[PDB]
Amino acid sequence: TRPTVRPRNDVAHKQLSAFGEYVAEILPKYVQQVQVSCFNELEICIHPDGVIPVLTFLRDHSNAQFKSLADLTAVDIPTRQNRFEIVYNLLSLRFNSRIRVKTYTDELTPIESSVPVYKAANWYEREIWDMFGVFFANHPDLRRILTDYGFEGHPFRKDFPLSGYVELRYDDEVKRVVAEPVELAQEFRKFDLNSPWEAFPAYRQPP
């Protein structure tokens, strides 16, 4: 119990590992990977076809009972051919436990909408469509939610520039707000911060 180091909890690590393979045994058709982090969080990585079967099972199964969708989001990794990682964070009140379910898609492949499983997923999928451009099939009402009306692009993609492409001002001649190509009085100053010395040997990739 060194004072500055976060203590381990092996009991939680063991319990989550056992449940991880329990889920893999029951849904082998869709489960591609199961892992538990060193701070005791369980992740199920699945084929995208399994979004509805897997999420239904975790919600309704008597030994799972993940009734609450805490969060639904996406991550963009341009180096992958399926660049978008879709992440579901679920909470089980009955068993006081959390689980993460992850799948993937590319710019042109639809993902089945999870609104039938969780009504909470409605706006989360609109946000993912808005910020990443991932289409969700059978969504009752898919449209932008955060961006401006008529906004072009998906800002949270890694290749969308920080300041975008257009900016707004009031123009007296046309007596309205107009959109024009972005110019910055002071360009954002890119910093190269990474140290050229490796920090964490435990995570070194093979050469």
Binding site: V34, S37, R94, F200
Partner: protein, 94 residues
């Protein structure tokens, strides 16, 4: 604090509380705005020996996730069922 006796009684009666004991305006009970200097303590790593950083390096103890299954007996739940909450004994019903 400068309210006359009659006014103190009037607002005490109207509110139904003894308001003079817990006034919402602050007077002389607050801390002085000048204070003596502090002398803060140091942490557990302030030692001259037996203190090698490698033995107290939380960041370097982090490990990649444990792969339970990859595509490269009794039923279980994620954890034991949550224990039912108890009613408060301080004040069970408001």
């Amino acid at each position: 604090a400068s309210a006359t006796r009659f006014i103190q009684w009037l607002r005490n009666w109207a509110s139904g509380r003894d308001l003079q004991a817990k006034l919402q305006l602050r007077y002389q009970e607050i801390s002085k705005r000048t204070q003596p200097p502090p002398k803060l303590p140091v942490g557990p790593s302030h030692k001259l020996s037996n203190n090698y950083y490698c033995t107290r390096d939380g960041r370097r103890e982090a490990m990649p996730p444990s792969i339970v299954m990859s595509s490269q007996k009794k039923a279980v739940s994620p954890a034991p069922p949550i224990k039912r909450w108890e009613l408060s004994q301080d004040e069970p019903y408001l």
